[PDB]
């Protein structure tokens, strides 16, 4: 049973922006994702400092992108430290957050889209490239939830029996928009990743399915 | 809640001894199951033939490994027809296997554990290299389930609440033993496909993990 929220005003507002955007560098929602994914390590890896434990769901601290052409599909995971249902709806929504209004500002005034991190909103920098994005997240205090998102006012938190277990972390399941697919090729997504993630504590793998020869 | 049955006495002979034999030819494992991935796949275009809507579930037909080294686990995935919960336990246990007995009398002959296949008994091959197995399964006509074995006299199907959605086919989860870890490198894995699965009508697809340079 999928619990509805409704995004905190300026969220909406937001993501209808940033979804709707002609902004001609969107390749940085990558880079915001990877940093967010980064965040996320360096948070169970802190935390671990103290709770070794922690690292157990999943020893590995690592960026995994794995492209789902199939299905345009582009996901982004992270063994970090993972959201909680509360967390979910804390972090991904409800709660206004300190820079949400305050980039929109900046937005109107000229600010690069790419300023989107530096107002603690990367996150949303994803509807850059995608017009719907599930948050399947695994903190070592929750089930395993999806969070998901399609830029309107409200989103949906699911207890999650549907996608693989993830020992600990996050996966943002990016639905690409039609016109974005080159985020699902490998040289794009190399490229992207080289140019803005260069100084990444984690190791960033990128899944690739090729047709044995 | 996974629900128990008990393997045929002698398909559990077969994997008791496939999963204790020193055979020096475990590669054709592989071999096998594409040949059964293949097997599927060939069902499901079939069927197709005379209801066009059971390709929709998963229009691509496909056979996809997946090495998950970190979890000495190797996927062998097929987007053919998949088994129903009924079909999982009936196939893959308590119904007597025409060829079982006989190919470990094969066997007690000197025949070639190769030869399984051919006594169509060559998923239990997969005991070459794993001592664990879990058939993930989605067929049209049933809901996502798991059926696991450990070559031991007993096997589970328990629902599919845990793993990713399977559009529909299956997914021949192997945890490798830790002497056949071999099977998770992509060269491995890709000379072994070209050796024994030259004639295969779909693609076969292996994905790599590949950390970005």
């Given at each position: 049973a999928s619990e509805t929220f409704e995004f905190q005003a300026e969220i909406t507002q937001l993501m209808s922006l940033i979804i709707n955007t002609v902004y001609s560098?969107?390749?940085?929602f990558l880079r915001e994702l990877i940093s967010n994914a980064s965040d996320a390590l360096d948070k169970i890896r802190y935390k671990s400092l103290s709770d070794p434990k922690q690292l157990e769901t999943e020893p590995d601290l690592f960026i995994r992108i794995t492209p789902k052409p199939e299905q345009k599909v582009l996901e982004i995971r992270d063994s970090g430290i993972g959201m909680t249902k509360a967390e979910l709806i804390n972090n991904l929504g409800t709660i206004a957050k300190s820079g949400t209004k305050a980039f929109m500002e900046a937005l109107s005034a000229?600010?690069?889209?790419?300023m989107i991190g530096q107002f603690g909103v990367g996150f949303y920098s994803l509807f850059l490239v995608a017009d719907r994005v599930q948050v399947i997240s695994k903190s070592n205090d929750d089930e395993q939830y999806i969070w998901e998102s399609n830029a309107g006012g409200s989103f949906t938190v699911t207890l999650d029996e549907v996608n693989e277990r993830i020992g600990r972390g996050t996966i943002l399941r990016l639905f690409l928009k039609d016109d974005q697919?080159?985020?699902?090729?490998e040289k794009r997504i190399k490229e992207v990743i080289k140019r803005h993630?260069?100084?990444?504590?984690?190791p960033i793998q990128l899944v690739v399915t090729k047709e044995v020869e």
């Open positions: 560098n969107k390749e940085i000229g600010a690069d889209v790419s697919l080159e985020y699902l090729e993630s260069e100084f990444v504590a984690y």
